[PDB]
Ligand SMILES: Cc1cc2nc3c(=O)[nH]c(=O)nc-3n(C[C@H](O)[C@H](O)[C@H](O)COP(=O)(O)O)c2cc1C
Ligand SMILES: Cc1cc2nc3c(=O)[nH]c(=O)nc-3n(C[C@H](O)[C@H](O)[C@H](O)COP(=O)(O)O)c2cc1C
C-alpha cells in the first residue's frame with residue numbers, strides 16, 4: 001500500500017494498470033516453486049521473523065536461572081529497480097496498444113529466478129534449507145524412459161512406507177523431459193504413462209532444476225512464508241524516465257521432508 | 266478408553282493429537298491385509314474368543330451322557346512399547362511444526378508387519394491359518410507379462426466354476442510388479458491390460474508377499490475379527506521420556522477359500 | 531496454560547493457590563523495573579521475536595536483485611526449578627496456616643533479579659541494551675543532599691530541551707537514599723523537597739543500581755516485551771518432593787533514550 005509511494009509517480013491510473021498487468025502475467029508462469037508449495041500469509045510489511053519453536057540454551061550448566069533465546073527464520077526483503085521511458089508510456093494515452101515494457105519484463109524474470117533459487121537451493125545466510133539439499137531423500141535409477149517410470153513407482157512405495165498420501169506431482173527439468181519424449185519412438189504418449197504411474201498426478205516442467213523430483217501435494221509439508229507479496233513501487237524520476245522497483249518479503253521452510261523424493265538420472 | 270491410562274501421561278491434548286495423527290497416517294497405508302479383507306467388530310476390550318461352531322467330542326463311545334467342548338479361536342493381544350523424549354514434544358507448544366516422532370514411526374511399522382504376518386502366513390499357536398497356506402488354491406503359469414494376464418483369465422474361470430462373483434482384486438509383490446512393467450517395453454500400459462482382464466478390478470502392490478494372488482471382494486470370505494482396534498496408551502515416565510504402547514486384540518479366519526487363488530511365478 | 535503441566539503435579543487446588551499467591555506477593559515488590567517501564571503483551575508462548583523495523587543489506591553493490599534480512603530482537607526464555615517437600619505441603623490440608631515455602635521464595639528472588647539485570651544492565655548475547663549503558667545521558671553534580679536537588683532541577687531542564695513532558699520519577703539506590711536522609715540533620719523532610727523538585731513526581735528506591743536516574747513516565751519510551759508472563763509449572767516428582775519451575779519469555783527495548791537521565795554521584 002502507501003509505503004510503495006505509487007501515487008507520487010507521474011503516471012495515470014491506466015498506465016499503472018498496464019505495468020501491473022504485465023508483471024502479473026509473467027510472475028504467474030515463472031514462479032515455478034509456487035506451483036506446488038503451500039503459501040502462507042501475507043502477514044504484512046512489518047512481519048520480520050517466523051518462529052521455529054525451539055530454544056537455544058545459553059546459560060552455564062550450573063546456573064540457578066537457566067536461559068536461552070527463542071529461534072526464528074528472518075524474512076528476506078528483496079528490491080529490484082528498473083527504469084521506464086516516460087514518453088513511451090505516454091503513447092498509451094494516445095491509444096497505442098503495445099508500449100515497450102522490456103525493462104519491466106527483464107527485471108520480473110530476475111526476481112522470479114531469485115525466489116526459486118531460495119526454494120530449490122536454499123540460502124545459507126538466512127538459514128533456509130532448499131529442496132535439493134535433502135540428499136537422504138535421493139534415489140537413482142538411470143537415464144531411460146523406462147528408468148523414469150520405474151523410479152516413479154518406487155517413489156510412491158517409499159511414500160507409502162512413511163504414510164504420505166497423495167496427490168503426487170513430478171517436477172522435471174524441461175530439456176530432460178524433451179529428451180525422454182524423443183526416445184519414446186512413436187508410441188503411447190509418455191505423458192499418459194507418467195500420469196498413470198503417479199496415480200492421476202501432475203507434471204510440472206521447469207528450468208529451475210537439472211534432474212527431477214516427486215512431491216506430495218497433500219498440504220502442510222512445504223511452506224512459503226510471505227510478509228509482503230510481490231509489489232511494484234516508485235523511487236524517483238530521472239528526466240524522461242521513472243525509476244520503479246519490485247519488492248517482497250518472504251522465507252521458506254521444508255516442514256516434512258518425507259513428502260519429497262529426489263530423482264538422480 | 267479409560268483402560269489405556271491416557272489421561273495420566275504428562276501430555277497436553279495437542280500433543281496427544283499429534284501422536285495419534287501420525288500413527289493413523291502410517292497404519293492407513295501399511296496395514297495391507299485390511300485393504301481387501303472384511304473387518305468385523307470392534308467387540309470391545311473384554312472379547313476373548315470367536316466361536317467356530319463345532320464340538321470336539323471327548324466322551325467314550327459307550328457313555329449314556331455323551332459330551333464334548335465347544336471350539337473357538339482365541340484372540341491375540343499384542344503390546345508394543347516405545348519411548349518419546351518429553352522436551353522434544355514440548356517444542357510443539359512453542360510452535361514447532363515437525364517434532365521428532367521416529368520412535369513412534371518405527372514401532373507402528375513393526376505392529377503393522379505383525380498383523381499382516383498373521384493374515385498372510387497364519388499363527389500356529391493361535392490356530393489361525395493364513396492366506397498363503399491354502400496350497401490347493403495354487404496355479405502356475407510362468408514369469409512373463411503374458412503369463413500374468415493369462416493366469417488372471419484362468420483364475421476368473423476357476424472362480425466361475427465355484428460360483429464366486431466379483432469384483433476381483435490382484436495382490437502382487439511390489440518388486441515383481443516393477444519387473445513386469447520393465448519387460449513391457451513401451452506399449453499400452455500394463456496396468457490397463459490387467460484391470461481389463463480383472464473385468465474392472467483393482468491392483469494392490471505390497472511387500473508382504475513374494476508372488477501374487479487373486480481374491481474376490483464380494484464380501485464374507487475373509488474375516489478379520491477385532492476386539493480392540495489399534496490404540497495408543499501410557500505405561501510410565503522414565504525421566505525426560507514417556508513410555509507409551511500400541512495395542513490391539515484380534516484374530517483372522519478364511520471362511521471361504523474358494524474366493525482365493527494363489528499365483529506361483 | 532496446559533503447557534505448564536500443572537494438572538499432573540500431585541497437589542490440591544488449595545495447595546496450588548498457596549504457591550501462586552506467595553510468588554505473586556514477592557514478584558510485586560521485587561520486580562523493580564516493572565515499576566516504571568511500559569509492559570507490552572503478553573503475546574503468548576509461541577512469540578519468538580520482536581521486529582526492529584530495519585533491514586540489514588547483504589547483497590553485493592552491483593546486483594540486479596538487491597536483498598537483505600529483516601532484523602528483530604529474539605525473546606529470552608528463562609527457566610528456574612525448585613523443589614518443595616510434599617509432606618510439608620500436605621499440612622495445609624490439616625489446617626496449617628504457615629507451610630514452609632523457603633525454596634519457592636529463594637527462587638522467585640533469583641528470577642526477579644535476573645529480569646532486572648536485563649532491564650538495567652542489558653544482555654549482549656540477546657542484543658538488549660540496558661538503561662545504564664546510555665552514557666551520553668549522564669550528568670554529574672556531587673554527593674550531597676543539595677547536589678541531588680540541583681541535579682534534579684537540571685535534569686528537568688534537559689528534558690524540556692528535548693520536549694519530554696512528565697510526570698517524572700527518581701530511581702535511586704536504597705543505601706544512597708538513606709545516607710542522604712542522615713545528612714539532612716533534622717529539617718524539612720528531604721522526601722518532600724525531592725517530590726517538589728520533580729514537580730509532583732515519585733521516588734522509587736531500589737538495590738538494583740548503585741547511583742540514581744530520572745525518567746519520564748509519559749509512556750512509550752521504555753518497553754518490556756512479554757511473550758509469557760511469569761508462571762509456575764510442574765516438572766516431575768522425586769520421592770517426598772515435587773520439582774516445580776518458574777518461567778517467562780521477554781525482551782526489552784529503550785525506544786527513546788531522551789526520556790532518561792543518569793545521575794553520577
Ligand atoms: C532491500 C533494500 C531496500 C531498500 N529500501 C529503501 C526505502 O525504503 N526507501 C529509500 O529511500 N531507499 C531504499 N533502498 C535504497 C535505494 O534508494 C533504492 O531503494 C534501490 O532499490 C537500491 O537497491 P536496488 O536498486 O537494487 O533495488 C533499499 C535498498 C535495498 C537493497
Ligand atoms: C500382551 C502384554 C500385555 C500387557 N498388559 C499390561 C497391563 O495391562 N498393565 C501393566 O501394568 N503391565 C502390562 N504388561 C507388562 C509391561 O508392564 C508392559 O505392558 C510392556 O508392554 C511389556 O511388553 P512390551 O514392552 O513388549 O509391549 C503387558 C505385557 C504384554 C506382553
Ligand SMILES: Cc1cc2nc3c(=O)[nH]c(=O)nc-3n(C[C@H](O)[C@H](O)[C@H](O)COP(=O)(O)O)c2cc1C
Nearest residue numbers: 057064065066067068351352355607608609610611
Ligand atoms: C530454558 C529451558 C527450557 C526448558 N524446557 C523444557 C521443556 O519444555 N520440557 C522438558 O521436558 N525439559 C525442559 N528443559 C530441561 C529440564 O528438563 C528442566 O526443564 C529444567 O528446568 C532445566 O533447567 P532449570 O532447572 O535451570 O530450570 C528446559 C531447560 C531450559 C534451560
